Amino acid sequence: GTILIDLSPDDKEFQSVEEEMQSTVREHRDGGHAGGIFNRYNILKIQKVCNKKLWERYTHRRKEVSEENHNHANERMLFHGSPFVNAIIHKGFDERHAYIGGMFGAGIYFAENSSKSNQYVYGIGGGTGCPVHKDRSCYICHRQLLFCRVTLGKSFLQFSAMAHSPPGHHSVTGRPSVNGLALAEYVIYRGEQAYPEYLITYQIMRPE
Ligand SMILES: Cc1ccc(-c2nc3c(C)cccc3c(=O)[nH]2)cc1
Ligand SMILES: [Zn+2]
């Protein structure tokens, strides 16, 4: 039931999504090991993901969470990188998209920094890099990230350097406590608490 609608680069929606992608790049403590060495992207395409059934599943859960949290869903737009993006846009998020070994337990992980989500496009730790060249810093191959609508509800704050949400909470927030330039990461434990709204196709750019 999924269709993908191409956005024009002249569309304000394309431009605001691209700006969020580009402006949330940062340097990573691995010196580029997992995601590659870059300061910006070449955005090739941005598609809107349209699936009525998946959207209704999201909004149903969002209403449940809102009602448990003084009419506040605490909805964010966050990045998700995964080798399973093609499954996710067709069938939705579920337990198979969880990071079993994540620092906040087995849940589905999202990032404010697009460059954090970029580290996971080819697998955990970048896997073995792109399928074609086996290069985690490949500047040729096309990569894809999701820009997702995510319901956090009442989020458990973890200060730091599928399972269940902590009791009385709907998500976990991983607050950076060492790297002053890192943005937060978030974990949900129910696939219905995210909708994969934009599919972004891109390359990382080699710095000059
Ligand atoms: C199988 C799989 C594991 C982790 C990810 C993933 N992890 C993230 C973490 C740990 C922090 C911030 C963002 C992400 C992310 O976008 N995907 C995606 C798929
Ligand atoms: Zn490649």
Swiss-Prot record:
Superkingdom of this protein's organism: Eukaryota
Residues the record lists as binding Zn(2+): C130, H133, C138, C141
Maturation and modification: Ubiquitinated at 'Lys-48' and 'Lys-63' by RNF146 when auto-poly-ADP-ribosylated; this leads to degradation. Deubiquitinated by USP25; leading to stabilization.
Tissue expression profile of the protein: Highly expressed in placenta, skeletal muscle, liver, brain, kidney, heart, thymus, spinal cord, lung, peripheral blood leukocytes, pancreas, lymph nodes, spleen, prostate, testis, ovary, small intestine, colon, mammary gland, breast and breast carcinoma, and in common-type meningioma. Highly expressed in fetal liver, heart and brain.
PARP catalytic domain span: 8-208
Localization per Swiss-Prot or TrEMBL: Cytoplasm; Golgi apparatus membrane; Nucleus; Chromosome, Telomere
Signal peptide coordinates: none
Annotated function: Poly-ADP-ribosyltransferase involved in various processes such as Wnt signaling pathway, telomere length and vesicle trafficking. Acts as an activator of the Wnt signaling pathway by mediating poly-ADP-ribosylation of AXIN1 and AXIN2, 2 key components of the beta-catenin destruction complex: poly-ADP-ribosylated target proteins are recognized by RNF146, which mediates their ubiquitination and subsequent degradation. Also mediates poly-ADP-ribosylation of BLZF1 and CASC3, followed by recruitment of RNF146 and subsequent ubiquitination.
Quaternary structure (record): Oligomerizes and associates with TNKS. Interacts with the cytoplasmic domain of LNPEP/Otase in SLC2A4/GLUT4-vesicles. Binds to the N-terminus of Grb14 and TRF1 with its ankyrin repeat region. Interacts with HIF1AN. Interacts with RNF146; this interaction leads to ubiquitination and proteasomal degradation. Interacts with NUMA1.
Family stated for the protein in its record: Belongs to the ARTD/PARP family.
Protein name, per record: Poly [ADP-ribose] polymerase tankyrase-2
Shown stretch of the complete protein: 952 to 1161 of 1166
